[PDB]
Design a protein around this ligand. Structure first.
Ligand SMILES: [Zn+2]
Length: 491
């Protein structure tokens, strides 16, 4: 009698770290000393010795077999992104590049000369001279929603996120045009952009639901669309597929997964046009945010997302700050951890589950990164003490006793570092245990116990084997206690 449409079905978490040269495709392991470290305190720790540090690229995450749109919305707002069915994030303390989750909307959008030009050229490419413009347009959104549906040469169509040979061929051509002529197999395209982990209703939908979404240009204020889940938006120019947008519809807005286009159409600036159309779509369907993925201030292929404005997730506070308020202090690849300036100096990682006095980015605030996560910050020692306290509950963690977070020139993939920004701090995990809150897992969390090859509801968490309790605790670190209560964890 299990309701699988209310479940997050996941594999045990993985922590994957290796040299950023060559594993990081954003920086290739090449940074100036001024951008190399996560904070000024770590820069100072390595002053004159920056060459002894080998930058690593590190992610943490879990494979999903089943997720619904509301849960994926929560995961995006925790800082995760899906790569096919794999939900991941970087370790922002240790990673070579500082990746921030960004979201925006037409409110934050400040239409620049460049962007206006891309729309003006798009209108001209697709509009017949017979087109008669309306006397006035309140905004560029109403203008686009007038001329685009009247074009006879250009049509965009939303449909299920399913593989076709014609989409794959377009993918291969786009990937070759950016740097990828290898690792371009049909299977890789299918897993990355098709074959999603969502519920069957969210993938297939209904004929009416797709019809409704495909008339989005004519939605009136206050109307909505029922669509949630993954979609493809196919761009056709005289019947030829010239671009493909892969999009996830969430209760809070639309997430761009990827966008490919026919290299012959370089003159159409389809990257910009598609982003603006998706900003218009978000506005027309009455949802609040457009998610472009990760923002990296020092990477041009990722910092273009700032042209569309918006706010950045501070994963330690679980709150967004406008990018304009912090751009000046993240422009050397720093980690930002917000602290209202009126708040005492922090002797610990910020509490994520016991989050009463949430930061207010409207009041004055500072970057507390070095007080918490610097070389003389409190996080590491608090986490070592917490590892020892968690032993009595049968949690098989080991203390991270190295002096530095960075690898120096003189691997268990199930071992997460004690200290990772945005994961529940180990000191808070101790609090959950001491207060009895971990027993809220009982009668809630489900295991797919691969020995029995059967589902079972956890009834007495503390009497489970330590291997199991450790895995569950790492899922809690990643997604929090309340989301874990709706998980099925494969072990
Ligand atoms: Zn990097």
């Amino acid at each position: 009698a299990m309701d699988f449409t209310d479940k997050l079905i996941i594999s045990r978490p993985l922590y994957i770290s290796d040299n950023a040269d060559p594993k990081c495709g954003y920086c290739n392991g090449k940074k100036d000393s001024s951008h190399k470290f996560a904070s000024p305190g770590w820069s100072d720790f390595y002053k004159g010795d920056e060459d002894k540090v080998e930058l690593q690229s590190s992610t943490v995450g879990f494979n999903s077999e089943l997720v619904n749109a509301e849960t994926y919305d929560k995961l995006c707002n925790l800082g995760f992104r899906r790569s096919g069915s794999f939900m991941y994030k970087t370790d922002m303390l240790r990673n070579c590049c500082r990746l921030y989750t960004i979201r925006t909307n037409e409110k934050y959008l400040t239409m620049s000369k460049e962007l206006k030009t891309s729309l003006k050229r798009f209108k001209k490419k697709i509009t017949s001279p017979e087109f008669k413009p309306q006397p006035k347009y309140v905004s560029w959104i109403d203008e686009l929603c007038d001329y685009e549906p009247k074009s006879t040469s250009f049509k965009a169509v939303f449909e299920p996120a399913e593989f076709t040979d014609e989409k794959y061929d377009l993918y291969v051509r786009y990937q070759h045009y950016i740097h990828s002529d290898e690792d371009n197999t049909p299977s890789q395209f299918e897993s990355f952009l098709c074959d999603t982990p969502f519920t069957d209703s969210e993938i297939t939908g209904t004929e009416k639901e797709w019809e409704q979404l495909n008339n989005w240009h004519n939605l009136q204020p206050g109307e909505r669309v029922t669509k949630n889940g993954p979609a493809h938006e196919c761009y056709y120019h005289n019947g030829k597929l010239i671009a493909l947008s892969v999009l996830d519809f969430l209760p809070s807005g639309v997430s761009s997964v990827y966008f490919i286009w026919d290299p012959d159409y370089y003159d159409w600036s389809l990257g910009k046009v598609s982003a603006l159309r998706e900003l218009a779509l978000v506005s027309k369907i009455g949802r609040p945010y457009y998610y472009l993925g990760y923002y990296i201030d020092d990477c041009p292929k990722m910092n273009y997302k700032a042209k569309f404005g918006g706010e950045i997730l501070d994963v330690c506070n679980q709150k967004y700050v406008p990018l304009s308020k912090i751009h000046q202090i993240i422009k050397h690849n720093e980690l930002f951890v917000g602290l209202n300036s009126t708040v005492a100096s922090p002797d610990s990682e910020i509490l994520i589950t016991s989050a009463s006095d949430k930061i207010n980015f409207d009041e004055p605030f500072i970057n507390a990164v070095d007080d918490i996560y610097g070389p003389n910050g409190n996080a590491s020692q608090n986490a070592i003490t917490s590892v020892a306290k968690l032993r009595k509950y049968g949690i098989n963690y080991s203390p991270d006793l190295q002096r530095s977070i960075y690898k120096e020139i003189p691997k268990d993939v199930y071992r997460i570092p004690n200290v990772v920004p945005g994961l529940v701090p180990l000191m808070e995990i101790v609090s959950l245990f001491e207060s009895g809150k971990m027993n809220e897992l009982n009668n809630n969390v489900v295991l797919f116990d691969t020995k029995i090859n059967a589902l079972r509801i956890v009834r007495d968490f503390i009497s489970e084997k330590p291997e199991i309790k450790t895995v569950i605790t790492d899922v809690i670190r990643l997604i929090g206690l309340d989301n874990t209560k709706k998980a099925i964890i494969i072990i």
